[PDB]
Symmetry: C6
Subunit: 30 residues, 6 copies
């Protein structure tokens, strides 16, 4: 149901934030 | 209902974060 | 209802992320 | 109630994102 | 309860976003 | 329960934001 769908989307959000963290570290280092 | 609305907005949020990840990747590439 | 209120704030969050993506792209293209 | 508390925290999150959008716009300008 | 746990995590999230807004403001002002 | 799952994903989100805050501070001061 929709509570699972909500959890799944939060999982996708975490994945994108992890990607942003990675790029911003690269920006800090460069 | 409203739980689906919440799921759909989280989907939109993930989508915008994907876009930020992309632009930051470009910024990190100089 | 508060569930609708939650959905509405998530829509606002998506909107602000969209704006952030827009500015970061401009930084990128700049 | 806790659902209202969640809505309120989301409102605080939207406010901080709006602040970030404003600063990134400033960065883009400069 | 878990609804309280959710509110508490959102509070932590708002806190981190406030930290990011602070740093981006500093970047903007330079 | 899915409510616990949601709380746990929000915890992971707070973790990633903490990392972004750290990197943006380095960008600011670096």
């Amino acid at each position: 149901g929709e509570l699972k769908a909500i959890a799944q989307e939060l999982k996708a959000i975490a994945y994108e934030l992890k990607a942003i963290a990675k790029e911003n570290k690269a920006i800090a280092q460069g």
